[PDB]
């Protein structure tokens, strides 16, 4: 019963607050002790800023002597947190997608779906609905590149033609010049590689300028905020999402159904109708991971030692089929996401509501 120390850096101020506030809110609904030991959870805002997240992670690993760290809410500070964790040798659970490199693989795993699983479900839909040419607009940063690179690699391997690439910066409040080019090229479909508030900006700008192709969005867009902001321009979007957005529609055999119901009932009872989100689920699921790996680490090591950090690291890879709201996690030395087809669905928006268009893979089918 000495504590297990968890440092979390998430984005609860600035425009990425749309992603970090739900992550931080969902901590009300996670375990407060594991295996006899209380969880000391220290939460700090980073504003989405890579330097502030580096500062928080640094102080967690050296001053707080954290056993685990988590964060951040968007890809650039998440990269920064991974770099701290892999230097300091501390288990890191990422709460936003990030490029895994050998520099980051040893000490980091990631809760959000990896870009290629999400891209696959979008591009298969494009192929099935008569799309040949695709344009892109996304952030001029590492998340923007993940998505563009996946669109080029997977999409071209499926016979899609990528006819236009545009970028914008996160704080931009206008994409007039990029929308101008995209409308000119008039692709059959446009993939928007963005998140939260910023994801609704190319959505509205494109419709206001009379684009009439299909618009596709990533799982960075999967909260009610996108509908609140995009209004009617949201209609008929196609959006990749984790299954936590619709546990009701899952088969009772889905290992993700129960925990998704658990999170959403609590979250929405507090925060209101349709307040569920892709993002709240990541911190909830991170604590489901901890519930599996910590009792295993506790057999051979005490909280607050390097040996405990090492034991968690190993357990992340020895413990298979970890059921959570967003998927069933089996991490490996080389797969730091640990996810398969059970971790994604496709949503549309119809009359201001998300509707599931394509279900996650069934438990008793191939993955
Ligand atoms: C918080 O959860 C998520 C965040 C993002 C945001 C990416 C970015 O803007 O860098 C994408 C997918 C997620 O599941």
Numbering used by the authors: 28 to 394
Original paper wording:
In this paper we compare the ligand specificity and binding affinities of the periplasmic binding proteins RPA1782 and RPA1789 from the TRAP and ABC systems of the non β- oxidation pathway gene cluster respectively. Data from a combination of fluorescence spectroscopy and ITC clearly show that both proteins have binding affinities in the nanomolar range for coumarate, caffeate and ferulate, with weaker (but still high affinity) binding of cinnamate. In view of the tight binding of coumarate to RPA1789 evidenced by both ITC and fluorescence spectroscopy, the genome context of the rpa1789 and rpa1791-1793 transporter genes, their clustering with coumarate catabolic genes and their common regulation by CouR, we propose that the components of this ABC transporter be designated CouP (RPA1789), CouS (RPA1791), CouT (RPA1792) and CouU (RPA1793). The structure displays all the features expected of an ABC-bacterial periplasmic binding protein; namely a two-domain structure in which an intrinsic cleft positioned between the two domains forms the ligand-binding pocket.
After a denaturation and refolding protocol that removed this endogenous ligand contaminant, a 2.5 Å structure with coumarate bound and a 1.9 Å structure with ferulate bound were determined. Thus, we will not discuss its structure further here, other than to note that the mode of ligand binding is identical to that for ferulate. A summary of the relevant data processing and refinement statistics for the ferulate complex and the ligand free form are presented in Table 3, and the 1.9 Å structure of CouP with ferulate bound is shown in Figure 5. Analysis of the interactions in the binding cleft show that the aromatic ring of the ligand is bound most deeply. Key H-bond interactions are formed between the 4-OH group of the aromatic ring of ferulate with His309 and Gln305 residues. H-bond interactions are also made between the carboxyl group on the ferulate side chain and Arg197, Ser222 and Thr102. These latter interactions explain why compounds such as 4-hydroxybenzoate showed no evidence of binding; they lack the 3-carbon chain that ensures optimal bond distances on each side of the binding cleft are formed. The methoxy-group possessed by ferulate sits in a pocket bounded by the side chains of Leu46, Phe306 and His309 and the main chain carbonyl oxygen atoms of Ser100 and Leu122. There are also close ligand contacts with Glu50, Phe306 and His309. The data also explain how structurally similar ligand contaminants like 4-HPP can be incorporated into the binding pocket.
